[PDB]
Design an enzyme around this catalytic site. Structure first.
Site, PDB file in Angstrom:
ATOM      1  CG  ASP A  89      16.961  49.875  -0.699  1.00 40.90           C
ATOM      2  OD1 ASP A  89      17.888  50.691  -0.457  1.00 40.90           O
ATOM      3  OD2 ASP A  89      17.118  48.642  -0.681  1.00 40.90           O
TER       4      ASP A  89
ATOM      5  N   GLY B 250      23.385  38.874  -3.096  1.00 37.77           N
ATOM      6  CA  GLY B 250      23.376  40.134  -2.356  1.00 37.77           C
ATOM      7  C   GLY B 250      22.884  39.976  -0.939  1.00 37.77           C
TER       8      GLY B 250
ATOM      9  CG  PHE C  61      16.686  42.719   9.317  1.00 40.99           C
ATOM     10  CD1 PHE C  61      17.544  42.752  10.411  1.00 40.99           C
ATOM     11  CD2 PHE C  61      15.866  43.816   9.086  1.00 40.99           C
ATOM     12  CE1 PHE C  61      17.608  43.882  11.235  1.00 40.99           C
ATOM     13  CE2 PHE C  61      15.920  44.939   9.919  1.00 40.99           C
ATOM     14  CZ  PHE C  61      16.798  44.968  10.981  1.00 40.99           C
ATOM     15  N   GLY C  62      18.039  40.408   5.310  1.00 42.46           N
ATOM     16  CA  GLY C  62      17.741  39.568   4.149  1.00 42.46           C
ATOM     17  C   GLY C  62      18.911  39.234   3.250  1.00 42.46           C
TER      18      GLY C  62
HETATM   19  C1  LIG Z   1      18.632  42.036   0.122  1.00 45.27           C
HETATM   20  C2  LIG Z   1      18.901  43.476  -0.284  1.00 45.27           C
HETATM   21  C3  LIG Z   1      18.819  43.674  -1.806  1.00 45.27           C
HETATM   22  S1  LIG Z   1      20.318  43.430  -2.554  1.00 45.27           S
HETATM   23  O1  LIG Z   1      20.785  42.134  -2.221  1.00 45.27           O
HETATM   24  O2  LIG Z   1      21.133  44.564  -2.308  1.00 45.27           O
HETATM   25  N1  LIG Z   1      19.952  43.425  -4.155  1.00 45.27           N
HETATM   26  C4  LIG Z   1      19.345  42.245  -4.738  1.00 45.27           C
HETATM   27  C5  LIG Z   1      20.279  41.037  -5.064  1.00 45.27           C
HETATM   28  C6  LIG Z   1      19.456  40.833  -6.370  1.00 45.27           C
HETATM   29  N2  LIG Z   1      20.133  40.507  -7.605  1.00 45.27           N
HETATM   30  C7  LIG Z   1      21.479  41.046  -7.848  1.00 45.27           C
HETATM   31  C8  LIG Z   1      19.590  39.590  -8.496  1.00 45.27           C
HETATM   32  N3  LIG Z   1      20.437  39.134  -9.478  1.00 45.27           N
HETATM   33  C9  LIG Z   1      19.904  38.307 -10.428  1.00 45.27           C
HETATM   34  N4  LIG Z   1      18.641  37.847 -10.554  1.00 45.27           N
HETATM   35  C10 LIG Z   1      17.830  38.313  -9.544  1.00 45.27           C
HETATM   36  N5  LIG Z   1      16.475  38.060  -9.413  1.00 45.27           N
HETATM   37  C11 LIG Z   1      16.021  38.716  -8.257  1.00 45.27           C
HETATM   38  C12 LIG Z   1      17.066  39.401  -7.679  1.00 45.27           C
HETATM   39  C13 LIG Z   1      18.235  39.169  -8.474  1.00 45.27           C
HETATM   40  C14 LIG Z   1      18.911  42.286  -6.226  1.00 45.27           C
END
Ligand SMILES: CCCS(=O)(=O)N[C@H]1C[C@@H](N(C)c2ncnc3[nH]ccc23)C1
Length: 289
Positions: A134, A14, A18-19
């Site tokens: 968020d 994801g 900025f991340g």
């Molecule tokens: C940077 C903005 C937030 S975002 O990118 O919109 N959502 C995150 C990607 C993440 N995600 C799907 C994960 N999938 C699987 N294991 C995981 N551990 C920790 C996370 C995580 C939540």
């Protein structure tokens, strides 16, 4: 302790302004038997964004709860200029993707089990005076078919002791279709604005993430063609002030829509508490059985 040289990129998970979060293997033995972890890093790194990221890391390290993703550590290996947050990786992925994929086997009792867990996670953040800011299914992860975890804290702030809100005036992209009116107009964030966003998460769940039924899709349809020299956020503010709201999802029980509508009260003080939300959800779920 995590050494940068042993982190191996596998897939992108994801992105944020900025991340970014990536699925990596941590492989110190270099034989592909290493643990698979989730790595959060800054996209376009600045001294200011690094300090904010340090705070985010302290926030997640301070949280230990069954419905909160586990902190594993950090990876510096190059001082404070390439800081990475290491978390457990959940192979089932985000609740946003899982729900869409498994929409035939996920019933209303199951949706309410996830709802209860998110509420419990949110009540726990409240004990530490943390405002998430968020909440969205995009940021909720699936541990197993009966368990979810809040999986990102990129916008999370600690309230100061002197007030019940945090004011954030900052560029760029905000998730405006999840924001409370006072967050749109005054940039004021509180437990009450997290309750409003929770109402939107409850809406996302009962639409089963049908693309054309998403909060941006429905609000844009409601705003219409008459955009004529006005920004989308100006139209959204006016619509919410005039009591325009996301509609009851197809097949959603009246009682569940009532919880959403209560979360979406223009008066912050009239919104329910997360403890009241858990009570109401747990009982509707128990009654369904
Ligand atoms: C940077 C903005 C937030 S975002 O990118 O919109 N959502 C995150 C990607 C993440 N995600 C799907 C994960 N999938 C699987 N294991 C995981 N551990 C920790 C996370 C995580 C939540």
């Amino acid at each position: 302790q995590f050494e940068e040289r042993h982190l191996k990129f596998l897939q992108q998970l994801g992105k944020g302004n900025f991340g970014s979060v990536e699925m990596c293997r941590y492989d110190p033995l270099q034989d592909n038997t290493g643990e698979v972890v989730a790595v959060k890093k800054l996209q376009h790194s600045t001294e200011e964004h690094l300090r904010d990221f340090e705070r985010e890391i302290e926030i997640l390290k301070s949280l230990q709860h069954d419905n909160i993703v586990k902190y594993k550590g950090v990876c510096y290996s190059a001082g404070r200029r390439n800081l990475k947050l290491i978390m457990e990786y959940l192979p089932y992925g985000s609740l946003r993707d899982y729900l869409q994929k498994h929409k035939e086997r996920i019933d209303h009792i199951k949706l309410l089990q996830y709802t209860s867990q998110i509420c419990k996670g949110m009540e726990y953040l409240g004990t530490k005076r943390y405002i998430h800011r968020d909440l969205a299914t995009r940021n909720i992860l699936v541990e197993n078919e009966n368990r979810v975890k809040i999986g990102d804290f990129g916008l999370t702030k600690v309230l100061p002791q002197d007030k019940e809100y945090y004011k954030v005036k900052e560029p760029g992209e905000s998730p405006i279709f999840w924001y409370a009116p006072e967050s749109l107009t005054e940039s004021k964030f509180s437990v009450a604005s997290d309750v409003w966003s929770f109402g939107v998460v409850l809406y996302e769940l009962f639409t089963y993430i049908e693309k054309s039924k998403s909060p941006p899709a429905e609000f844009m349809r409601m705003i219409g063609n008459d955009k004529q020299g006005q920004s989308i956020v100006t139209h959204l503010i006016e619509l919410l002030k005039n009591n325009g709201r996301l509609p009851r999802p197809d097949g959603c029980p009246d009682e569940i829509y009532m919880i959403m509508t209560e979360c979406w009260n223009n008066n912050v003080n009239q919104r329910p508490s997360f403890r009241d939300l858990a009570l109401r959800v747990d009982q509707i779920r128990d009654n369904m059985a």
